[PDB]
């Protein structure tokens, strides 16, 4: 009787919705025993197999369904999602467009197509396709929420207030109904969700990893209970997809080689293949052991490898980011597993014991935001490799085109040597700043900039246009090598005014909300002639920001946009700003380190989420408590005082310029030593037979 197969298939669909994936698989397969040419059952089975990480087996059943039913649009759209996950974008597009050609009214396929456009950087098409999906299927949480992030990306704040209301409403309903929330964990920081909801979002995405390891039927691992097998050394394993040209390496690439080999054995587990860059070379050369898990795609086999190395502390540097294999942590190959640096938030997951943070970022009163126990670094948990990557910015000189420290700037390894042969340079006391007068050399340098020349040679020294670094040395532009030439950086290169205060923010525009721009507008209105310097990130967000700024009483000529730049130029041109205005919604993280390395004071208002308090943690470690605001009034007042009291601005810029060297903020050696002391507190705690507890010293 046909109801037999149909009933098994429809019951399986219910079981899938309930989260009982195993039982759903069983019922789908029973349906195929009863009715072998059952197109729907082939496709529904492939769906749950995809959810279990059995991608090739899912593809096979999708094709079977389509062989049985060539116009089965559900199967084409579902297959597209599997191909997208396998990184076959053209295959995914071919499937989605086939499904929509079969059924133009197929809401889900329009939304899945939109997700390709969103990931490709084609935000207008993504918005169009998400809007078609919501028109066809008005109750559609994935489409609504991913549309909302599209609008965040381009700073479209049309009906932003009702958007946040409905986002929160959708999450509440999904959490109450035991469904996976349609807001992603890495985005939950951006919306006015409760801390409970953000933690629950995290836990649910973590649960996805369990469905993919449960099919491995692996028993629990036996873990080391001492250090005898490792010669008294603690074995630390750093797991990351980002050993390569990625901001995480720009932060911590020095740390594996700075560990003390008398008490630590360092294993780096790469989740990505070798991208050929010096970042990957350095970690592969300096770690005691380097293991390319990108060659071991089975998470059961990869976890076995970790466990065979005898790791004591395994460090999750991905969290919920591209390239993560949190399945590895779900299998628990190590007795202690910690979140660190790469992901600004909680995993919400039982399989992570600790998050490495600090008392400024994560004060004890807000411990309930995290599923992990808190493990404190003594100053800030943030770190950057700037002192190793960008030593040419330790010193600077200027040209007195008339004296400013940030209108025409020179940096270089050989800059001092160059200046030794210019007898008319003046040394200004502010740690000392040399000042080139408006002489023959200065005119040639300024002429190079105005004509867009690439570089000139003066007294045997190469002098480079700071806009042309990729034509001179591509490896210098990326931060893989220290630039060799003397580089010239000027406000004229970016259209910034020579006679006014520059406030900057170099973050992606999705970190800005209406509340932030209003606060920036309040500041500019109180500092005459000052401008705000932002990035085209993306470009299509520029007219939205200009329009909202103008509605707040700010003419368009008050906001200047530049393009996104290679890493080294992005850090170097921070020297042209007077002040950085941090985004309170989600602070600059890497970019906070970047701007302070240039000596630019950063004003910040720490919030409640981890992502909203990082900049203040950085400024506390730096030693500039006067840059940290307790509320919006203080944030504006601090920024206006810096833009109007020029003696105070010189004082505060002088602090940053000096303390980036003398404070712990950029000191990777001290960081690694304190990191080691924290690892040993963790290990001893476990070795005494205790479950994880807070390590706040």
């Amino acid at each position: 009787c046909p109801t037999h197969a149909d009933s098994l298939n429809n019951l399986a669909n219910i079981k899938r919705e309930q989260g009982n994936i195993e039982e759903a698989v069983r019922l789908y397969r029973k349906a195929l025993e009863v009715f072998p040419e059952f197109a729907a059952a082939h496709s529904n089975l492939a769906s749950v197999l995809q959810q279990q990480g059995k991608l090739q087996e899912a593809l096979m059943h999708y094709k079977e369904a389509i062989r049985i039913s060539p116009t089965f649009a559900d199967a084409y759209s579902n297959m597209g999602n599997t191909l997208k996950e396998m990184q076959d974008v053209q295959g995914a597009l071919q499937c989605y467009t086939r499904a929509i050609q079969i059924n133009p009214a197929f809401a889900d396929a329009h939304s899945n197509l939109a997700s390709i456009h969103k990931d490709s950087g084609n935000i207008p098409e993504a918005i169009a396709s998400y809007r078609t999906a919501l028109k066809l299927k008005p109750d559609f949480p994935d489409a609504y929420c991913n549309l909302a992030h599209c609008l965040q990306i381009v700073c479209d704040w049309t009906d932003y207030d009702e958007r946040m209301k409905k986002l929160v409403s959708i999450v509440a309903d999904q959490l109450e109904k035991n469904r996976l929330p349609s807001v992603h964990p890495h985005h939950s920081m951006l919306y006015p969700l409760s801390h409970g909801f953000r933690k629950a979002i995290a836990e649910r995405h973590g649960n996805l990893c369990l469905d993919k390891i449960n099919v491995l039927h692996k028993p629990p691992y036996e873990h080391p209970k001492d250090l005898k097998l490792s010669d008294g050394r603690l074995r630390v394993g750093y797991v990351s997809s980002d050993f390569g040209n990625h901001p995480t390496s720009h932060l911590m690439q020095s740390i594996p080689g700075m560990h003390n080999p008398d008490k630590f054995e360092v294993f780096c587990y790469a989740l990505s293949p070798d991208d050929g860059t010096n970042f990957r070379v350095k970690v592969m050369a300096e770690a005691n052991h380097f293991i390319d898990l990108s060659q071991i795609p089975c998470n059961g086999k990869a976890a076995d490898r970790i466990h065979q190395d005898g790791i004591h502390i395994l460090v999750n540097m991905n969290g919920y980011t591209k390239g993560a294999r949190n399945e590895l942590f779900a299998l628990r190959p190590a007795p202690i597993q910690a979140m660190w640096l790469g992901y600004p938030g909680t995993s919400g997951a039982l399989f992570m014991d600790y998050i490495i943070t600090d008392q400024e970022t994560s004060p004890a009163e807000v411990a309930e935001q995290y599923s992990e126990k808190l493990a404190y670094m003594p100053h800030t948990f943030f770190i950057g490799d700037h002192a190793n990557m960008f030593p040419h910015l330790k010193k600077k000189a200027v040209i007195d085109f008339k004296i400013y420290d940030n209108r025409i700037v020179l940096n270089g390894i050989d800059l001092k040597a160059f200046l030794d042969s210019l007898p008319d340079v003046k040394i200004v006391k502010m740690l000392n700043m040399p000042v080139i007068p408006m002489n023959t050399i200065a005119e040639a340098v300024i002429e190079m900039i105005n004509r867009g020349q690439i570089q000139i040679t003066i007294n045997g020294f190469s002098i480079s246009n700071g806009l042309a670094t990729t034509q001179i040395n591509n490896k210098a532009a990326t931060g893989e090598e220290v630039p060799r030439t003397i580089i010239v950086t000027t406000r004229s290169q970016y259209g910034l005014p020579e006679d006014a205060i520059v406030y900057c923010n170099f973050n992606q525009l999705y970190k800005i909300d209406p509340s932030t721009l209003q606060m920036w507008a309040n500041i500019l209105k109180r500092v005459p002639n000052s401008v705000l310097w932002l990035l085209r990130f993306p470009a299509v967000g520029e007219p939205n920001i200009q329009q909202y700024a103008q509605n707040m009483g700010l003419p368009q000529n008050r906001i200047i946009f530049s393009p996104v730049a290679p890493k080294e130029e992005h850090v170097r041109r921070g020297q042209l700003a007077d002040v950085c205005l941090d985004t309170p919604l989600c602070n600059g993280h890497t970019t906070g380190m970047d701007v302070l390395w240039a000596g630019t004071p950063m004003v910040t208002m720490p919030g409640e989420t981890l992502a909203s308090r990082v900049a203040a943690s950085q400024l506390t470690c730096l030693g500039c408590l006067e840059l940290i605001a307790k509320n919006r009034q203080e944030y504006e007042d601090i920024a206006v005082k810096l833009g109007t009291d020029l003696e105070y601005l010189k004082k505060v810029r002088g602090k940053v310029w000096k303390q980036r060297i003398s404070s712990p903020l950029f000191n990777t050696k001290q960081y690694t030593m304190e990191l080691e002391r924290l690892y040993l507190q963790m290990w001893e705690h476990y070795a005494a037979g205790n479950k994880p507890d807070h390590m706040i010293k």
Binding site: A5, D6, N9, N10, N13, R16, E17, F38, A40, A41, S43, N44, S47, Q50, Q51, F72, D74, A75, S77, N78, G80, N81, K84, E85, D108, A109, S111, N112, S115, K118, D119, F140, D142, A143, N146, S182, H184, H186, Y320, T321, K322, A324
Partner: peptide
């Protein structure tokens, strides 16, 4: 930046 999630469609047998 992570890949945007997608929506699988469940087919009802009739």
């Amino acid at each position: 930046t992570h890949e945007t999630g997608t929506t699988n469609t469940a087919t009802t047998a009739t």
